Amino acid sequence: TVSTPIKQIFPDDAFAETIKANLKKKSVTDAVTQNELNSIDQIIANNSDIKSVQGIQYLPNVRYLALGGNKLHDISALKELTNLTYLILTGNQLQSLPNGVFDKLTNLKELVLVENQLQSLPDGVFDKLTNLTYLYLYHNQLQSLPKGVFDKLTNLTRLDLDNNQLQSLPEGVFDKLTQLKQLSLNDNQLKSVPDGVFDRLTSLTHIWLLNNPWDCACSDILYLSRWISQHPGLVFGYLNLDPDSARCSGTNTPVRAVTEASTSPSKC
């Protein structure tokens, strides 16, 4: 039975110190076994200067991993942690995600990728995550989304895309999300949304639409204008309801108050 110092298994000094604390050991030099590592079901290591989680491959049973406010660039080492069910990576430095990095993480229920510097999502990056409930992607730099990116997420109840740089949404992007309760699209660069884009959202209770440059002169605005008018009890500002918070670029008047007469197909 091999007995190896925590520091040799986890070469990042900060992550070694996390593991020593987790196992209530007195020193990062202390020799540990695979059996002890199998006993770890959670890691909570916020704001801990962690640059690499190399070594975490040897924690097969970890189901809850909270790594906010570190310095991570790479999450390769998480790929075969098949019991992972909450993964919180807020405030790291992941700038791109490998295709399929989440493929084996089939028990994920909450995935938090906030404040990373994501500029694109791979096609199908979430396809294997059929049990996902909360997907948080806010405060990134996404300019567009792949077609069908959310399609396998049938149990999704919250999808936060706020504070990105989204220029448009793909048609039908939300069609498969019939259990979706919350959707945030505020603080983006949306001018319009596609005809019909919210129509399958039968279980929606909150949507946020503020701080987008909505193009109220163009006639593609009419779906959104009519949809807000028909669903004002779902449209939230920061705090509470606010169906007027979706504002027309320039004039700053409410999108929901646009008339067919004031628009024109020639402005698109």
Which string of DSSP letters, residue by residue, matches 137-194? --SS------TTTTTT-TT--EEE--SS------TTTTTT-TT--EEE--SS--S---
Structural domains of the chain, with CATH: 1-268 (3.80.10.10)
CA 57 to CA 66: how far, in whole Å? 16
Geometric angle at alpha carbon 59, from 103 and 39, rounded to 5°: 130
Take residue 182 and report the two structure tokens written for it. 């919350």
Query: Under a CB-based contact definition with an 8 Å cutoff, are residues 224 and 214 in contact?
Result: yes
Query: Under a CB-based contact definition with an 8 Å cutoff, are residues 12 and 70 in contact?
Result: no
Residues in contact with 226: Cβ distance below 8 Å, sequence separation at least 6, in sequence order: none
Q: Measuring CA to CA, which residue among 71, 15, 69 is closest to residue 43?
A: 15
Query: Under a CB-based contact definition with an 8 Å cutoff, are residues 186 and 163 in contact?
Result: yes
Deposited experimental method: X-ray
